[PDB]
Design a protein around this ligand. Structure first.
Ligand code: MG
Ligand code: MG
Ligand code: MG
Ligand code: MG
Ligand code: MG
Ligand code: MG
Ligand code: MG
Ligand code: MG
Ligand code: MG
Ligand code: MG
Ligand code: ZN
Lengths: 138, 165, 189, 53, 68, 142, 102, 72
RNA sequence: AGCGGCGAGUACACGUACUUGCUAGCUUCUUAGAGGAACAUUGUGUGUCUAACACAAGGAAGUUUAAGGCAACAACAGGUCUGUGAUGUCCUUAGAUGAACUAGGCUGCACGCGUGCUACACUGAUAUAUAUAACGAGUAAAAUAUGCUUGCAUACUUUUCCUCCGCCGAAAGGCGUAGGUAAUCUUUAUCAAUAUAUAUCGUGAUGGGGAUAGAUUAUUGC
């Protein structure tokens, strides 16, 4: 009936709710096809193409996003969708089929299921950034 | 019901998708296609007028040049109607922050700027006479009436039917 | 069933050199629809050799300060360039770019060695990873300098540079720089 | 008549001064400390400020 | 580098020298013994001492250990 | 596809006194006159009912005559006050917009008037220094 | 009914102890209480320079004064609650008992 | 080394610019180079040739790149 | 602080979007207390096989996981008496080197040096439109209401800090009234600019660049 998984990036958080339904997918109350940067639209569509249309007809997905920027928000949504489909199968379908799907997403890449640990570094006085120092003159 | 024609439709709006769609409200139509297509509608049917004075003003401090489209008044107004759907109770200060751009200050560093208010106010006043927006007796700002919301929604469903069918 | 940019396949492309085969990657994990992956390729010594070859190209078009970090713009420049290469000399655009990589790097160089206290400009050999790095770098700068203060756009110059490099014609920035390096190396040893 | 202290001093540097020294330079004003920076760094601990990184 | 100061090596040799019977070739098992046998305020050095003790035992199987 | 003949296109015009007005577009070409900016040219081009999408070389005689009458006395058209120079004129108290040669005659007279009065700012124009309060110790060095 | 107790303190050491005493003490009288609400912690920052003189490498130190706050709601009488506060609460946590009557 | 591109189409040049339609690759830079015309003119002739369907789009156009090709 | 649950609506479909009243339960999202986790774990390799290093697997994490804070004997005739009711000597103390008040100067310009900002353009300038962050901050004087012939009564009222919204004005700003001593309001399911889309310019010191100058207006303040 219902699960809730999240995906994360630098400061973006995406929460996906997966239920039984008729096939809809929506983001912040619009279709997925209104995600803004068009050149990055293939990222969101990757997991849907791998598993196929066969296993996803009977589900509805809702996603909310908060924080970050253009690129980080897109990447968090990929992770939310991929993890959510996996967890829905664990709870309401046999898990031997779940293992087969988790194999499929892994042979393409990780980071469809594993978060990224990189994070911004603080700055220190005596320079402009974390490493760059003010120019010395002699 | 609507016989008018839709503005130029680029490709890449026609690629197949791996899910299923709906088209009931304006949250289901491309933002750029709606704004341009509906802007012609207001001009053609004479629903608002382009204030004479607006023929020789710029939209904000940080522009330093005129809009150079001679249809900017209607295009901007039609985007305000879409915005009021997304945020109900909105004033003039909100719309000054919405249409902001950066201002180049000579040899000094750049900053963000703010749009002019008389243009924004005059559009909101005209739409009240047309009966599409109302000023709330409750809290604040001004939202869409029932007539305004219905007119916006109906055009959106027409646009989608013109593309995919 | 995966294409690059949704149009080109790389399922029949080969290296045909046997020296650079293991160094440039068009294979299982490198098959991507779009060249934007936020990978971590500079944490070990040789993980740079698993990055998809076309993503290495787009990582080099964002140079000279004015264009640092503008990754999406670089993807667009390369995408339209691959279209031109297909339109004229009709072939797989990625296969052409593979041929350019195999011909755009020097096979030997010269270095200063003080073996007996006396220093010479004695020649050395080049490793396959160094050859691949040089080819990508030499092609990008040639296109970049060709388009400065010119009518032709950045994407047209890039397409012309790649075709000429793979044809061994000495009208490319890459081939004439490669020959200048090898001429000196031949002279020294 | 009398002309002693007749220039208005409602603002500027001469309007306020260190709570401790009576010195008129480098006064901390965030959260109304009203202490010059040299005095503050001496008494910063007993007030409650702590150094962590 | 990860070289162990004499604080770690002094204590770890005493544990082997006094409780030889209880200690085995599993890091987790040797960890619980060290928690109640010794006194260590911080868990990071509790882990390191136990890890060294386990490393000591593997050396014993090949014969005597110089210093124990 | 516009197929205008060479003999109808003329390369050098003469709109106001001592101007050349070459082969540019109408907006940019009018900016060679000594008191027409990019803002003022666009407004003047619109009040003259002329098409901004054509070169200055195919402007008929009547269009040139119409534009000139607009640059002169732009108040009987609808150009407001805050688009003008010389907003008080100091001599007749009226709003006028100078141009070309006139512009030069006005700048010369301003300098000599506040020099005969020994005004501090006009006295620095005579010494050839900066007048707007710049530091002038490390810059302006020639 | 619907009485609110608010706690503020610079010290996390003591404020959790006092917040524990009230919850246990009120449980004995068999009262229905809502658990502690830990509001976001705020910090006051001051960044002044060392070196009362002018020379040397310019170095700075970063000072911080952080404040804590708790919040407990319960249904009971005012007079029993207000005498429940004066139970030798250590004097670094100042207690404000406020009736949220509406 | 100055370019002297023309800024309009002459009567004589009118017939010559239309053969461009029969070109492998069609882009403003190539049209301007072969016929010594401006780039603003080269965009005008493409828009004229495209609307009457004498020139076929190769792919989805951008606002910065506008390649075409012959119809066949 | 969120998510749900029960209604009432405005729209369209063989259930979606939004508005609005009430309010079973739950903590994925938010906030904050206490714990777990990594030890070179397991293999192969190098090593006196000791101290230890390299590659592979698993793992969120294996350069002590990343960044900081603190900082040992001793020195410098290093800087600070212009931070100090910390302080030793000397000088001055009513024609003051004390305390004030009025007007100037610290910025003055043939030149040399250090840190920087803006640029030399088409991977661009101009115009319009779309999408999208994190750390913060905020309330004894003068002024306002009403008279005596700005002087002195009366109110120690609303005033002062951030300011939603409405109206006026090309703009900068002005007028009138909400909320807030604050996860409650300004204001952040968003307070930015690089980005993205379309069009104009078209290799020409040009629509690059914006120094130096002329005229006009409004606020801060005696
Ligand atoms: Mg930086
Ligand atoms: Mg904008
Ligand atoms: Mg200098
Ligand atoms: Mg939680
Ligand atoms: Mg001192
Ligand atoms: Mg004085
Ligand atoms: Mg000075
Ligand atoms: Mg410095
Ligand atoms: Mg400019
Ligand atoms: Mg210029
Ligand atoms: Zn002080």
């Amino acid at each position: 009936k219902r699960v809730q998984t999240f995906g994360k990036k630098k400061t973006a958080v995406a929460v996906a709710t997966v239920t039984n339904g008729k096939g809809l997918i929506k983001l912040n109350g619009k279709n997925l096809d209104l995600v803004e940067p068009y050149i990055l639209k293939t990222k969101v569509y990757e997991p849907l193409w791998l598993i196929g249309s066969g296993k996803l007809k009977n589900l509805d997905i809702r996603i909310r996003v908060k924080g970050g920027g253009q690129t980080s928000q897109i990447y968090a949504i990929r992770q939310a969708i991929g993890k959510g489909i996996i967890s829905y199968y664990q709870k309401y379908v046999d898990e031997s089929t779940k293992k087969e799907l988790k194999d499929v997403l892994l042979r393409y890449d990780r980071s469809l299921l594993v978060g990224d640990t990189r994070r911004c570094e603080p700055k220190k006085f005596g320079g402009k950034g974390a490493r760059a120092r003010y120019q010395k003159s002699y | 019901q609507f016989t008018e024609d839709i503005g130029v439709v680029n490709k890449r709006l026609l690629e197949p998708v791996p899910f299923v769609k709906t088209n009931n409200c304006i949250k289901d139509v491309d933002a750029d296609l709606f704004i341009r297509s509906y802007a012609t509608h207001l001009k053609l049917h004479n629903k608002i007028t382009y204030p004479k004075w607006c023929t020789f003003v710029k939209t904000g401090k940080g522009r330093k040049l005129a809009p150079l489209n001679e249809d900017w008044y209607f295009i901007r107004a039609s985007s305000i109607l879409r915005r009021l759907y997304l945020h109900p109770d909105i004033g003039v200060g909100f719309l000054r922050r919405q249409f902001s751009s950066k201002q180049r200050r000579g040899v000094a560093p750049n900053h963000t700027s703010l749009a002019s208010g008389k243009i924004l106010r005059s559009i909101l006043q005209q739409l009240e006479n047309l009966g599409y927006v109302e000023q709330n007796p409750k809290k604040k700002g001004r939202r869409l009436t029932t007539k305004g919301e219905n007119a916006i929604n109906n055009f959106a469903r027409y646009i989608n039917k013109k593309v995919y069918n | 069933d995966i294409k690059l940019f949704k149009k080109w396949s790389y399922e029949e492309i080969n290296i045909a050199d046997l020296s650079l085969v293991d160094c440039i990657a068009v294979s299982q994990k490198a098959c991507v629809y779009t060249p934007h992956t936020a990978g971590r390729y500079q944490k070990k010594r040789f993980r740079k050799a698993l990055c998809p070859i076309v993503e290495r190209l787009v990582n080099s078009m964002m140079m000279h300060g004015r264009n640092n970090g503008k990754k999406l713009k670089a993807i667009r420049i390369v995408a339209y360039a691959f279209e031109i290469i297909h339109l004229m000399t009709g072939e797989n655009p990625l296969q052409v770019f593979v041929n350019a990589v195999q011909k755009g790097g020097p096979r030997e160089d010269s270095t200063r060695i003080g073996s007996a206290g006396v220093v010479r400009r004695q020649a050395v050999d080049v490793s396959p990873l160094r050859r691949v790095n040089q080819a990508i770098y030499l092609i990008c700068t040639g296109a970049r300098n060709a388009a400065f203060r010119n009518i032709k756009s950045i994407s047209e110059c890039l397409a012309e540079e790649i075709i000429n490099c793979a044809n061994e014609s000495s009208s490319s920035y890459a081939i004439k720089k490669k020959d200048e390096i090898e001429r000196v190396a031949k002279a020294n040893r | 008549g009398c002309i002693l202290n007749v220039h208005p001093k409602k603002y500027g540097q001469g309007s306020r001064q260190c709570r401790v020294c009576s010195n008129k330079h480098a006064i901390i004003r965030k959260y109304n400390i009203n202490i010059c920076r040299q005095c503050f760094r001496e008494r910063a601990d007993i007030i409650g400020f702590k150094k962590y990184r | 580098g990860r070289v162990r100061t004499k604080t770690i090596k002094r204590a770890a040799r005493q544990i082997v020298e006094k409780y030889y019977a209880k200690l085995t070739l599993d890091f987790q098992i040797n960890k619980k013994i060290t928690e109640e046998v010794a006194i260590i305020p911080s868990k990071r050095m509790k882990n390191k001492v136990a890890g060294f003790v386990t490393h000591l035992m593997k050396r014993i199987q090949k014969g005597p250990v110089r210093g124990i | 596809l516009q197929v205008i003949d060479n003999n109808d296109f003329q390369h050098i015009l003469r709109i106001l006194n001592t101007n050349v007005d070459g082969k540019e577009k109408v907006i940019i070409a009018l900016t060679a006159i000594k008191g027409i900016g990019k803002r003022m040219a666009t407004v003047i081009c619109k009040q003259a009912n002329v098409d901004p999408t054509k070169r200055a070389g195919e402007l008929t005689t009547e269009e040139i005559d119409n534009i000139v009458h607009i640059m002169s006395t732009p108040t009987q058209f609808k150009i407001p006050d805050w688009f003008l120079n010389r907003r008080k004129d100091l001599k007749e108290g009226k709003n006028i917009h100078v141009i070309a040669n006139q512009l030069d005659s006005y700048l010369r007279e301003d300098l000599e008037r506040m020099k005969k009065i020994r005004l501090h700012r006009g006295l620095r124009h005579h010494w050839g220094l900066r007048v707007r309060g710049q530091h002038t110790k490390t810059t302006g060095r020639r | 009914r619907r009485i609110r107790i608010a706690l503020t303190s610079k010290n996390l050491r003591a404020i959790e102890k006092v917040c524990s005493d009230i919850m246990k003490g009120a449980k004995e009288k068999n009262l229905n209480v809502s658990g502690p609400v830990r509001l976001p912690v705020k910090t006051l920052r001051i960044t002044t320079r060392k070196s009362p003189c002018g020379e040397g490498t310019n170095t700075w130190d970063r000072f911080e004064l952080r404040i804590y706050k708790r919040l407990i709601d319960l249904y009971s009488q005012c007079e029993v609650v207000t005498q429940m506060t004066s139970i030798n609460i250590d004097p670094v946590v100042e207690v404000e008992v406020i009736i949220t009557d509406s | 080394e100055k370019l002297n591109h023309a800024v309009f189409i002459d009567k004589s040049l009118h017939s010559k610019i239309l053969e461009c339609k029969n070109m492998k690759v069609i882009t403003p830079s190539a049209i301007a180079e072969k016929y010594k015309v401006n780039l603003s003119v080269a965009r005008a002739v493409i828009n004229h040739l495209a609307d009457k369907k004498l020139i076929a789009e190769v792919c989805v156009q951008s606002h910065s790149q506008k390649l075409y090709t012959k119809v066949a």
